[PDB]
Design a protein around this ligand. Structure first.
Ligand SMILES: CC(=O)OCc1n[nH]nc1CNS(=O)(=O)c1ccccc1
Ligand SMILES: [Cl-]
Ligand SMILES: [Cl-]
Ligand SMILES: [O-]
Ligand SMILES: [Zn+2]
Ligand SMILES: [Zn+2]
Ligand SMILES: [Zn+2]
Length: 231
């Protein structure tokens, strides 16, 4: 049911409806000769849409906007990038040119600039301390602490019990850390525990890449991260 990496040619975007007014978007990208899927989120806010994360590149993100127009037909007015890597900010310029107000924490904006990635225009205040949460229209933004990156945010949709973990949460099929160049391995399990403690009611958990599941993805990610720590 959920679109898999094998079903999506690079350059195309699929949408998957999770609940009333909540979708994920799924794209694929080549990196080091392999193809990876990648998720973001779309949340309806009245007659507008809030977008969480780009579709990993300008071409994918243009296709994302086109696919949103075709399947939902409402304007994306704000977007949030959940950390500074290109699967989250790559395509911010496309969003901006389309009239989307792009947002990220000051930490994310800072790190994107240092890295040479695209920089969301607006700053999300109130998220710089581990455990901080702020409302952003139909979602809550939560900074759990450093994990996959020092700046990574998670997003909760209370009306639908959807927890979007981004790249701090691994899908079950991933049993090895992969690349963790910007991660804080020492803190990642503690940051995951903050997520568990703040959103214990979550029913639908969306990793940054791959298949959704339940809150068991949190323990699974901790298992993988600890195993990698002990390599
Ligand atoms: C900096 C870093 O941690 O990169 C790894 C990562 N973790 N989440 N997203 C990414 C982006 N690379 S990836 O192609 O999706 C990948 C997926 C599985 C294993 C390795 C790489
Ligand atoms: Cl604005
Ligand atoms: Cl703006
Ligand atoms: O990433
Ligand atoms: Zn990342
Ligand atoms: Zn603006
Ligand atoms: Zn990622």
């Amino acid at each position: 049911e959920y679109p898999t990496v094998s079903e999506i040619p690079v350059g195309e975007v699929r949408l998957y409806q999770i609940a009333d007014g909540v979708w994920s978007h799924i794209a694929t990208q080549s990196f080091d000769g392999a193809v990876y899927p990648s998720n973001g989120l779309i949340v309806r806010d009245g007659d507008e849409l809030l977008l969480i994360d780009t579709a990993w590149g300008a071409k994918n993100t243009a296709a994302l906007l086109a696919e949103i127009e075709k399947q939902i037909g409402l304007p994306v007015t704000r977007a949030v990038s959940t950390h500074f890597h290109d699967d989250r900010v790559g395509g911010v310029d496309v969003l901006r040119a389309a009239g989307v107000a792009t947002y990220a924490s000051p930490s994310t904006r800072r790190l994107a600039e240092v890295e040479g990635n695209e920089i969301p225009t607006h700053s999300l205040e109130g998220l710089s301390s581990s455990g901080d949460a702020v409302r952003f229209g139909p979602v809550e933004l939560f900074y759990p602490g450093a994990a996959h990156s020092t700046d990574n945010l998670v997003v909760y949709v209370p009306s639908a019990s959807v927890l979007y973990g981004g790249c701090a949460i691994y899908e079950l099929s991933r049993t090895s850390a992969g690349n963790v160049a910007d991660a804080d391995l020492a803190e990642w399990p503690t940051s995951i525990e903050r997520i568990q403690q703040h959103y214990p009611e979550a029913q639908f958990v969306i990793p940054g890449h791959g298949l959704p599941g339940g809150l068991d993805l949190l323990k699974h990610t901790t298992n993988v991260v600890k195993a990698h720590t002990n390599r």
